[PDB]
Design a protein around this nucleic acid. Structure first.
Lengths: 418, 473, 473, 418
DNA sequence: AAAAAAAAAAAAAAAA
DNA sequence: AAAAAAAAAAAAAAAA
RNA sequence: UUUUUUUUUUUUUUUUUU
RNA sequence: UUUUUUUUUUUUUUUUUU
């Protein structure tokens, strides 16, 4: 018996409306057959369409549109449907569907101008309800209404060619591993031997004043230049502490809290990072809270590192790749890094207007996608490297910390394709 | 060899009990959960502005094709998707002469002019509610663009065009929605720029807000907002367990009174007897002294949690079995002592913090695209990172532009299974009834709590404010 | 040889501009003026009472045949007549346990128990308005019959069944509608006896309220009331001249405060620019000292008339050309001096009194039927009798049971043409949106003013009350 | 050409739905032909229906109902419509309309069981919209939609057999004309000659004390019996006033206001009416403000006057016709009358319970229509008459007022018929 | 008046 | 403390 | 404010050290 | 209070007179 539906349309142009109509007709309990309904094609669909129209199709639905009005394939299935119309002796067989307002009823195909069409130009819901009312009027065979099949075929056909897939992928990060730390942290007994109204930022190596003890990893007599009074300190007065257990967190005393002891470490790391990048002779821009460092035009060969560009030219303003480093010890010992972009009018003086700087940065980032960001970040990190596999932060005469020049690798089991 | 785990995409339910990951697709095919017979929209503003509103409404009455269908589904029309017809006829209009704006906008004092315009709209809308026999569901108020750029703080009125309160804030939209709370009128603020912008051109001759490639999306989201305001439920969830209340805590500042006073607000979501769900604000705004505390005293903690537990009980009948307190700042023991005091033994109280502060950024080996939305980096049993913003295949484009920033989920107190809490946040990132988006970059409880707090911090005379989102978003 | 003159039956307009003398017939064939897409009805009361409401609603969903079609047209269904579908699905229900009534109804103090029940309903309905995302147009509150016969004054609670505020009046319906004015919620009070009464039987085994012969009529009037409350206009007039305001003055007593204080209320009707008409209450309730004055002082007279003239002006733009002040008690010169002071020269102020006190009864020679509705006995240029109640051919039955009593129309002051004023009252007897009747026995301005005064005399904390009839009838 | 509609129905039973359907189809712009559409009938409609079906009918509409399912005439027009169906070669010709829920689709006529029917059982609007959608589907000829013709034929056919008509009718009233008044009103100079602490109600003739002057129409020496001091009054001290100008209202003085002078007249008339009905020896019932007078059982022959009943028997209580008289001078000089009904348990003592009295009165009035009310009122008025054409109120020795026993006649130019 | 971890209000712009 | 010509609140009932 | 996202501006507070 | 209508109960005030 005939219980299937044929819907003719322009596949490259009328995909949306045909898909919606097929989905709703299936959900309402009708066996819908369409070209876009099935995923994959063979040489046999040319005969398949004709045999379906001749034997299994009980009724023809045509998507009337400017693209589908005069399409050779559309006209050929229209002719097959029309001949089936003649041999079936069923007047209510061809049901055209006009969905284009630009296609007037006086410009439709000759085989359609004499057939009543359901109006979809104004309201699609009204057209669908008219289709329904006509269909229950014509006693067309149907099954129990069930949208489960609708959603089913929705997943297997639509959105199936591109979705989530399972495959392992390697991932990087802006986190930088720290290879090593000094064996012990030194608190030196200075008291008057260090002036009370003295700032520790200008001192050579990083050092922070906690209570009366100077917090640094360096040797006691390393601060002779900035502190001439420090020539006669007794190293036995140091309360040097095994930093390894500080990282483990096992240490605890009334003298210092482990959270507070770890508090002093990150500030020392930040000061060492700032001092090291000062040693690299790189300029700086003042941020609201942090400090960002960029490169001039001429410091690098062609203002580029490796095969990667780091400083470019845009109209009359020079954009410079910049970084900002923060030391965090909670998840892992990591010198965290961030990406920032700043502009210079001549390449040596920074623009003092914040609004134009922000506008230029966002304009340059508008077209900046994934790969360029990673390339420039990794290039700058490799530029600041002291060795092939790591770079060190100078914060003592014999005390050093090694930080990997390679960002922290991560592994993800789920990815996709373009 | 650290491992990355991905949570399956949450499923949101639609009418007739079908499920779809994308809200737009599921709403298009299956429609909204409840049947709304019609929307009697009220329009107030300039008589000239009525024409643009009518043009936009009968424009969205017709199917709209966007730039790329695969990236964003096209907008087919309000009636086709919502099963509710909403035309330009039958709209109640009250005329607002541009001269009326002229007297009050052209004022040197920013706060005074903002209060004048807000009153000029509010008195007219109240008279519309209380005078005409016509019934209005939601109000579409239209304001020009000159007012928009000269009715907000930090907006300097040019001297050549100056012609001529302090208790309220200059924030026009927030004050406008706050002063309507006493009368419980669902309203929607528009600018004709958000309306058919093709009339406006820049100095170059192009529209300032080029929305041609996004016209279908804006129609989708405006229709969704209008439907939700009209009293309709677009979609609901299916993966949330029974007996689970969440609550979302956000702290906001109040500048009108001496000291910021740190106003606190909350939003609540849970399940009902059977399959129904409730997603309503639960706000009793509790002010907190001291400039930068952000930690509310145990008395108001007890008040808040008792109110939430009650509002659950009169709707279900029994106390929630587990509560996952959501906030985007951590808590000290001061609140938790009172919280444990007021909770019963059966209830399992859990506190979860969400943070965007941590600049953890992931880097893929190759490609110009970002990470999946749903990956979780489990730091330990208590802390994890969730990338709710980024790329998802169904929308073909990353939800962000630059490298996404993940959410810092840490269970401050309680015990909590990490997988479940990292699974609930991903589900909660879908309930953005204010914007037809595939997903949101944070749990909607935090976002909607922030919104309701911003609205409630604009007025000081509010007493027992409404707690349904129709009057807020 | 005294002569009797008959005024032609006034014509009331319907949708698409057709005219019909009978409101029921014209509404059935031509439908309501405006298109209402749907009615989201809210139901609150006993869970058992929900079943009867649903049964009545799906009963009236179907055509209903009355005893005699020629006497009263049959009821065909809500959607057929109103072009608006309104089914039992989608209704928002809040459960009210019968025990809750049990605690508060079974109270010795009448006023205390009435206040308790009114609060028990009002707090729940306010929470319904301010808590659920669902939108409700009008509220159908259902109360039992035991409460109805034991929640009103002069109702003695039997001692054997007694189990266990004074500022408010014991009138349940009036207090219930008064306490909702602040929130502007259109509500409707029902008893299940007014609902499907077939369940109830008397001692003889018959229904107490035998409505079988009137079922179509009750369905007609309930549907009309529900449609009007939903924000729809059933019918309008066509014979009223432009620039004609009427106003209707009614005086009511207030017992809660010391001295009756003679609260005064007014209702207003006029025309708009084009063809639209406005029929809204205009109440600023003006209390009048002294026990039995019924004559308000010139200050409040000026306030009332200035408010009415303004409310006309902001809707039309120009002052009314002639005003026919309607009241059912006469006026002395004290009010009229102030009235002439505040009116402009162009306005022609007219004062008309309506009285049922005069027992003039007409007697026909033969027949068991009464007089035509519309006959006028012109006593002189200033006084006349109008028989707005009685027999009219279209309804086949006299509007009254015994001999009708006419209206005593006398123009107290002004000049006024007697034919026009006797023609306007007959037109005004048709605007009974509260009851689907062919005509009313007095001008609706007087009746609706009395209703709004009764509602507004139940609460003393009302400030700037709503003045639309949706919240009153 | 065929452009008319046939609608078959049960005229004595299915009038409402057929009328509504015809009215709406006409209003929508369709030429509707129906039996109830035309007012008046002849011998020729038997041929008219057949010729309309054969030539002018383009389509058959059947009202399917329990009454119209097996009606011989309905079946004969169904057969004619069916044969037209065959010769017209139009499959969509017969359109049955099922409007009865008690008539299942398995019990419909044989010629209808094979034809699809539009459902009117649940919603009439849904059925009408289905009819429409089918009709625009079938390209049925139509005109421009216009409800003016609908309302037109509504007035000429419906509600036309019984409406307002113009014809003069005579009318009566409860107003009673007063033929004459005394020529002058007397104010007597009594002062101490009448005791200050004396009541005037018990005095024989009506009299009211205004200021110090006794207001009455009677002669000065008529009050000797109740006032023995009044034997020596000088009639020259009277300020007798020409009552005719009081009625005209021309008189005015500082001594008495015309409104106040007319104020005293109505009280005197009421007192005279009360005294006269006391002279008639009729009992009274105390009303809230007025006083009502009724008749016993036995005072009248068979407790009836003329050929009319005035006192009847109902269960164990005796209802009595009662009247109340009020004198009003504003519209006309008229002794106004009213109708009241009271009940007695034994016929001589009144029931003291107000609730049962009201219930009995309304129960007896429930079936009391126009004619009985007029008959009893006019009978009582004729009973109280003193002469054939008028009755007098005794209020002076030589001063009397004549009140017509016939109620005030009125004329109305508009009436109707049963 | 500094130091780092934590804090919200505000503006500017781009696509979704 | 009356008179009448007016005044509103309240309950009881029957059909519309 | 149809949005969402990504930044740039400031300001603030706590724990602690002088 | 779906109504409407018709009553019966009370009470009250004003203008006036002592």
């Amino acid at each position: 018996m005939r219980n299937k539906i044929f819907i003719s349309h322009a596949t490259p142009d009328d995909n949306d409306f045909t898909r919606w109509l097929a989905l709703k007709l299936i959900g309402l309990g009708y066996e819908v057959w369409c070209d876009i309904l099935f995923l994959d094609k063979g040489v046999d669909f040319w005969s398949n369409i004709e045999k379906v129209i001749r034997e299994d199709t009980c009724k023809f639905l045509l998507v009337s549109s400017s693209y589908s009005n005069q399409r050779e394939g559309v006209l050929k299935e229209l002719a097959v449907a029309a001949k089936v119309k003649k041999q079936l002796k069923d007047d209510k067989f061809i049901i055209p569907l006009a969905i284009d307002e630009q296609l007037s009823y006086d410009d439709i195909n000759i085989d359609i101008v004499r057939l009543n069409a359901i109006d979809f130009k104004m309201s699609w819901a009204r057209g669908l309800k008219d289709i329904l009312e006509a269909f229950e009027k014509q006693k067309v065979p149907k099954e129990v209404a069930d949208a489960s099949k609708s959603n089913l075929l929705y997943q297997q056909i639509f959105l199936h060619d591109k979705s989530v897939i399972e495959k392992e992928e390697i991932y990087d990060s802006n986190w930088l591993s720290i290879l090593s730390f000094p064996e012990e942290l030194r608190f030196h007994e200075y008291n008057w031997m260090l002036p009370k109204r003295f700032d520790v930022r200008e001192l050579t190596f990083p050092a922070v004043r906690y209570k009366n003890y100077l917090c640094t990893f360096a040797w006691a007599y390393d601060f002779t230049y900035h502190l001439p009074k420090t020539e006669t300190y007794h190293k036995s007065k140091t309360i040097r502490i095994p930093t390894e257990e500080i990282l483990s967190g096992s240490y605890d005393s009334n003298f210092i809290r482990n959270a507070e002891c770890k508090r002093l470490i990150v500030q020392l790391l930040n000061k060492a990072f700032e001092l090291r990048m000062k040693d690299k002779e790189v300029q700086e821009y003042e941020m609201s809270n942090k400090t960002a460092y960029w490169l001039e035009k001429g410091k690098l060969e062609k203002d580029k590192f490796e095969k990667t560009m780091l400083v470019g030219k845009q109209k009359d303003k020079n954009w410079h790749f910049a970084i900002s480093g923060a030391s965090k010890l909670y998840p892992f010992p990591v010198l965290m890094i961030s990406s920032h972009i700043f502009f210079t009018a001549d390449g040596k003086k920074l623009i003092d207007s914040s609004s134009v700087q922000h506008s230029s940065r966002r304009r340059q980032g508008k077209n900046w996608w994934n790969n360029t960001w990673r390339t420039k970040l990794l290039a700058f990190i490799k530029y600041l490297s002291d060795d092939d596999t790591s770079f060190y932060l100078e914060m003592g005469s014999e005390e050093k910390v090694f930080v990997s020049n390679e960002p922290v690798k991560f592994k993800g089991n789920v990815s996709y394709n373009i | 060899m650290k491992e990355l785990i991905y949570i399956e995409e949450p499923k949101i339910l639609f009418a007739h009990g079908q499920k779809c990951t994308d809200a737009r697709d599921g709403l298009a095919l299956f429609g909204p959960l409840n049947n709304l017979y019609g929307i009697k929209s009220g329009v107030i503003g300039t008589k000239q502005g009525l024409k643009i509103f009518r043009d936009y409404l009968d424009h969205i009455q017709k199917p709209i094709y966007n730039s790329n269908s695969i990236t964003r589904p096209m907008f087919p029309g309000f009636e086709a998707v919502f099963d509710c017809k909403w035309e330009s006829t039958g709209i109640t209009f009250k005329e607002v002469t541009n001269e009326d704006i002229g007297k009050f906008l052209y004022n040197s004092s920013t706060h005074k002019r903002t209060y004048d315009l807000v009153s000029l709209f509010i008195d007219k809308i109240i008279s519309a509610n209380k005078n005409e026999d016509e019934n209005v569901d939601v109000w579409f108020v239209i304001v020009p663009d000159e007012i928009y750029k000269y009715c907000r703080p930090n907006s300097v009125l040019p001297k050549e065009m100056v012609q001529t309160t302090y208790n309220y804030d200059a924030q026009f939209h927030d004050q406008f929605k706050a002063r309507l709370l006493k009368h419980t009128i669902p309203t929607q603020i528009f600018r004709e720029s958000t309306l058919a912008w093709r009339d406006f051109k820049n100095a170059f001759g192009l529209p300032i807000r080029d929305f041609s490639k996004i016209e279908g999306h804006l129609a989708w989201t405006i229709s969704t907002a209008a439907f939700y305001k009209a009293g309709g439920k677009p979609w609901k969830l299916s993966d949330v367990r029974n007996g689970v209340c969440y609550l979302g805590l956000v702290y906001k500042k109040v500048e009108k009174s001496k000291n910021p006073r740190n106003a606190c607000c909350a939003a609540q979501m849970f399940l009902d007897n059977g399959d129904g769900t409730v997603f309503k604000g639960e706000v009793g705004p509790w002010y907190n002294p001291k400039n930068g505390q952000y930690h509310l005293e145990p008395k108001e903690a007890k008040a808040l949690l008792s109110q939430s537990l009650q509002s659950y009980k009169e709707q279900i009948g029994e106390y929630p079995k587990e509560v996952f307190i959501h906030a985007k700042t951590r808590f000290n023991h001061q609140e938790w002592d009172a919280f444990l005091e007021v909770t019963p033994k059966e209830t399992n109280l859990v506190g979860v913090t969400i943070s965007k502060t941590k600049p953890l950024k992931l880097y893929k080996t190759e490609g110009d695209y970002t990470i999946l939305r749903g990956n979780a980096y489990v730091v330990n049993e208590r802390s994890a990172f969730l990338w709710t913003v980024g790329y998802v295949p169904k929308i073909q484009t990353a939800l962000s532009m630059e490298v996404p920033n993940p959410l810092f989920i840490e269970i401050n107190k309680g015990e909590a299974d990490i997988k479940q809490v990292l699974k609930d946040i991903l589900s909660l990132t879908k309930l953005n009834y204010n914007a037809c988006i595939f997903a949101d970059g944070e749990p909607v409880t935090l976002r909607f709590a922030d919104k309701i707090g911003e609205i409630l911090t604009a007025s000081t005379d509010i007493k027992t404010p409404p707690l349904a989102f129709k009057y807020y978003i």
